[PDB]
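Table S5 (text form). Sequence records supplied for joint modeling of the two-component complex.
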Amino acid sequence: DDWAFSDGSIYNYSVNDYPNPSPFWVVFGALVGGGQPSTVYFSRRRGLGFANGTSVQASK
Amino acid sequence: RFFGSTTRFNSVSFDRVVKIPTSITTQNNGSDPYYRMRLYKQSNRTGSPNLNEVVQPQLADDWAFSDGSIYNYSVNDYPNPSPFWVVFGALVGGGQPSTVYFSRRRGLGFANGTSVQASKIDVVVNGVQRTPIYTPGSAPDSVYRNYYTYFADTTGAATGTSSTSLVNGIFFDAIPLGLATNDTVEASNNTNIHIGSASIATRYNYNDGSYIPAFGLGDFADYLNGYYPSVVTFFQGRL
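The corresponding structure-token record, covering 299 residues in total, follows.
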């Protein structure tokens, strides 16, 4: 259930090993038990830029 | 262009041949003295993360440059060097894939192909200026996204040890290794020569006499002898 950003390479856990972040690949810490494929759902936050790069009230 | 990673398989003997990422192989200039790389098995420098470069690779931690062919050890066998492939001496035990981390040293050429003092180079990553590292293991060595400076010629390479050391390239081999794949790096020479006396050697911070980075202008204008462009125009959205 643990994930991080990766650059398409495999990450094996170590006390001094860290994944290389990249916005195109996600690396998981371990395989899901049972050996069967599962579904990963991606939900993204999208920016608006209504106020010339500044914030606006949520009611607007 | 400074830090990358790749998957090294450990199943069959041919899996000892590993391709360098394309972003790491660029600007090699036919293996110029500034084309230097160092391999790591971990993302930190703590512990034993070093992958040793040797002539005849023996162990799984020993590597050499290869031309995409397999290398089998012999007392009279040597790998054929090439800047695009890395060959390892043996497979990592367990048969599971591992990660090979590529860290490249990139040359600057600020002084018309000659060296400049290490205090004259300012590196900005993601809009924030970073502190150079001179003595390994010091206080700025444990901070992420910090850099070392070095000099390279046909007789070898030397890493900058002080602010007065003559260096012409940079790399990012700190205790935290490397950068994010989309990190932006801007290395600038802040030497305020051939300019007015009211100028300052600091980056633009809404000041007067600060410097604006010109990416690649020094490859054509001689910033050491003072040869600078004299005619400017605009054409098709290009200066």
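Note: Chain A touches chain B at residues 7-12, 14-23 (CB under 8 Å).
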